[PDB]
Amino acid sequence: GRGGSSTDQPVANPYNTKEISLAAGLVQQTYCDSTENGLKIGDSELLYTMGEGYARQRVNIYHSPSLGIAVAIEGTNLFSLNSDLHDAKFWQEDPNERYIQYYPKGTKLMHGFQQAYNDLMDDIFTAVKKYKKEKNEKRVTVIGHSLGAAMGLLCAMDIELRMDGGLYKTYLFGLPRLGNPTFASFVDQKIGDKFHSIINGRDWVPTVPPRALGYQHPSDYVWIYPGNSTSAKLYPGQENVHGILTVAREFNDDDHQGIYFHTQIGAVMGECPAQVGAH
């Protein structure tokens, strides 16, 4: 359902921290030149890349024994998230024609995120199907960070709804809000068992766009607190009141570009190639 604010207390982190650490590396690498044929990141082999973070986010496709076909989506600042929240990029709109028929009536998505996913979605589908066939791999894992984490949530839903065999898991780092309460509860219904939002320390990105604009996160996140530490808890339900707003955010991108279970997602000025478990 729609628009709540869970009051449940946090619980121990139940997510696989090795998978998280890996997924963090796989997405860090989308901030890097990714043309090296067969590059290995953690357990995974890079198979394909498209985009470079100029007209479109860079997307990397890997095969992984633990995660299957892994699609990681870059989160560079194609537009600014921390500024001018009245702008067109933040407006709510109907789902794009490609997948609107799969969504409940009244579903709304943020224009900026949806447009950026739509520039990639057909290319992503084509490549995923190619590499699932080539690797005899049914599992599809979708990973994103920053802008690419909201894009990643849209993509993860798109794969579950539209691709044969659906979604295995999604790992989303520093996830902005993407859709309205109707969207958010459809995420719970369709991929709730498969959804992993990871928030590091004082990261501001999960507070935007604001709820007052009609935006709502899906249920559950793991909050690493302190930022860059190995301490984390899960905050159940949508928009848990005991979570991130109980601790002062920061305006900068330090924790956003921090250390997630020993892997840095430093973004453009981070590690290239990515370094799984280097911290």
Ligand SMILES: *[C@@H]1O[C@H](CO)[C@@H](O[C@@H]2O[C@H](CO)[C@@H](O[C@@H]3O[C@H](CO)[C@@H](O)[C@H](O)[C@@H]3O)[C@H](O)[C@H]2NC(C)=O)[C@H](O)[C@H]1NC(C)=O
């Ligand atoms: C969590 O770890 C991240 C790195 O993954 C830390 O982010 C970094 O924070 C520093 C400030 O503390 C940023 O400032 C710059 O540092 C560089 C290198 O030390 C320096 O040459 C610059 O002049 C500037 O001072 C740094 O850019 C930033 N790194 C990234 C990739 O964003 C973050 O501070 C850590 N959090 C905590 C609570 O310690």
Ligand SMILES: [Cl-]
């Ligand atoms: Cl590009």
